[PDB]
């Protein structure tokens, strides 16, 4: 069956270089139009570049002068050389075949064959323990007798981080959000618990943050930070 399988992604520092390869099977790269499409985590699709059958290349403005698409018919593979990488470039890069318009030798905007994609992460970061800050309950996080409080787990690398409340004795009403990848290359997430507002004075709430990659455990008591 027709397949495309991208490779070459991983961690790379800003300004560094990285080359992705797009190897095809059961169909030829030579007589097809080939595109690259990337998608930042939690964002939409963005077209990157395209190469024609006879060799013409076009690039998006966000990538012009820094990326270069290549075609190797001997290996039946497609390439994407990436230089001067920025934090805007971290994304899953997809390799796709562009169907040709019938009447002309012009590629349509219909991409029918796709690869599975390869993740590129542009970051200078290595193992970095998180910083935990309290999300204290106040008049604005309380409504209908229930109170919302949480912990902000900030600037850690790499994934994952596990959060519990009161050493696992408090599970109901807890939600730990997925991490977000910031432009600095570090991760951040939040975890919240919804508690009765009358318990804020007596009950103690402690979030337990674990980052095994850095061998760090942080306990943070969250209380109404009155002024």
């Amino acid at each position: 069956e027709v397949q495309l399988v991208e490779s070459g992604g991983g961690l790379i520092q800003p300004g560094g270089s990285l080359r992705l390869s797009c190897s095809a099977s059961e169909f030829t790269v030579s007589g097809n139009y080939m595109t690259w499409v990337r998608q930042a985590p939690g964002k939409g699709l963005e077209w990157v570049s395209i190469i024609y059958t006879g060799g013409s290349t076009y690039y998006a403005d966000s990538v012009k002068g820094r990326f270069s698409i290549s075609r190797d018919d001997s290996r039946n593979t497609l390439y994407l050389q990436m230089n001067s990488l920025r934090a805007e470039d971290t994304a899953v890069y997809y390799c796709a075949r562009a169907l040709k318009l019938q009447f002309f030798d012009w590629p349509s905007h219909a991409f029918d064959i796709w690869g599975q994609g390869t993740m590129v992460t542009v970051s200078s970061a290595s193992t970095k323990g998180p910083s935990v800050f309290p999300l204290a309950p106040s008049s604005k996080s309380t409504s209908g007798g229930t109170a919302a409080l949480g912990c902000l787990v900030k600037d850690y690398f790499p994934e994952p981080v596990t959060v519990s409340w009161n050493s696992g004795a408090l599970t109901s009403g807890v939600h730990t959000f997925p991490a977000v990848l910031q432009s600095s290359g570090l991760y951040s997430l939040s975890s919240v618990v919804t508690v009765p507002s009358s318990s804020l004075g007596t009950q103690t709430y402690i979030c337990n943050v674990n980052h095994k990659p850095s061998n760090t455990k942080v306990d943070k008591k969250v209380e109404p930070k009155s002024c």
Partner: protein, 209 residues
């Protein structure tokens, strides 16, 4: 041009739903994307389908507006849908902002929005993060806009895609990273959430409590 899509569309299984692609010669291809997967070509031109794509999916176009219709929704149709087209601009192609189609399996829920100001401890670390938490809503699609006073803010904003809570409703989070100087140089900051055409807005100020 740029292609505009509604953020959300929904239907119960067996119902029909149509999503629109508006662009600011002119015709549109459609793609389907399930979580963790590559996009899949559903329909190109006005109504031609690749092999394997069910007859449930059909498309039309009326002047500036292209449409994709699904005729008996199956839960497997729940995914993000992107349109693509040629562009008047420099770039060869533009993709739409994306529409999440939800196959309804529970009643709609209005979101709860909790906005946390920067903690004094983080300010002591020379940082300031605004945390906007959106919870208990369905379908799992929201839009988050940030304001400094009355001026919209785009830089320093990061938002997670909605995921299920323990009670099977959706939650999402949004962050606005500021300098401590930026935080204290404005009268207030606001997080504005749009869900199913309705808007909830919360506001924090540096002088709290």
């Amino acid at each position: 041009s740029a292609l505009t899509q509604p953020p959300s569309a929904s239907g119960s299984p067996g119902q029909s739903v149509t999503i629109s692609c508006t662009g600011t010669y002119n015709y549109v291809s459609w793609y389907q994307q399930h979580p963790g997967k590559a996009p899949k070509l559903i329909i190109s031109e006005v109504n031609k389908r690749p092999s394997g794509v069910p007859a449930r999916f059909s498309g039309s176009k009326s002047g500036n507006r292209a449409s994709l219709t699904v005729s008996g929704l199956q839960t497997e149709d729940e995914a993000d849908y992107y349109c693509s087209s040629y562009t008047d601009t420099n770039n060869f192609y533009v993709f739409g902002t994306g529409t999440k189609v939800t196959v309804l399996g529970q009643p709609k829920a209005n979101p709860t929005v909790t906005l946390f100001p920067p903690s004094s401890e983080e300010l002591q670390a020379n940082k300031a993060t605004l945390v906007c938490l959106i919870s208990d809503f369905y379908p799992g699609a929201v839009t988050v806009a940030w304001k400094a006073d009355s001026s919209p803010v785009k830089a320093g904003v990061e938002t997670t895609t909605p995921s299920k809570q323990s009670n099977n409703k959706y939650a999402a989070s949004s962050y606005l990273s500021l300098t401590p100087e930026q935080w204290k140089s404005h009268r207030s900051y606001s997080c504005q959430v749009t869900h199913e055409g309705s808007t909830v807005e919360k506001t924090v100020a540096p002088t709290e409590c």
